[PDB]
């Protein structure tokens, strides 16, 4: 799909 490390794992 698209990388978890840029999405589900990304933080603010």
């Amino acid at each position, epitope marked *: 799909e*698209e*990388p*978890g*490390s840029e999405t589900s*794992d*990304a*933080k603010s």
Partner: antibody
Amino acid sequence: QVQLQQSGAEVKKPGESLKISCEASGYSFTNYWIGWVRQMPGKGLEWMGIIYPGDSDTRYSPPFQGQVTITADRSITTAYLEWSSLKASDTAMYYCARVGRPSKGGWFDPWGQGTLVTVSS
Amino acid sequence: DIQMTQSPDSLAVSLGERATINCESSQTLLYSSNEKNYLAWYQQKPGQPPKLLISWASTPESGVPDRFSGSGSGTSFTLTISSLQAEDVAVYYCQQYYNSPYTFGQGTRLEIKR
């Protein structure tokens, strides 16, 4: 600069509990994922899991899901790895390592120097 | 869960010769949107923690000697040592950081062939 200072070598009996620590400095502790890698004697690196101290969110790889618990303490910039009941096959080197870029997933950089855990009767 | 398979397990290369270490992922590590490969290479010398050599597949850390290069894309990646030197004997690991867990390859042991 960035330092990841791990607690000392442990020698434990099977069935005992154990929490090892990694003290971080030189960066904003809550803006980086930080985690643990196991290396059993003579074998490869195994990614165990990571924690984001900004919101305590965690990730584990399946073989360590439900085996260990990773926590962090924002107030002392320290991450932890905990077993309830050690077994002999938990004998290994355990590396703490910070993800190499803030606020997102990624590779590990830098690494701690390691904590050797020996579990034996 | 992405599996990372390195080949060979063990590699013997004569000093001054090319050393080639392969890494294959079970899923692609190419993010089509930014065209980036979510692949790192690590070097671990005996008695020492692993050290990052390459991120984003094709990109060495600062101070990594020019004889190291990383290549490939998608599911097929290669670490190349153009001319093997004594200081290069180590175990090399690839690692994907595309989807958690960020799994390592099983390691490739590089030795001097004599």
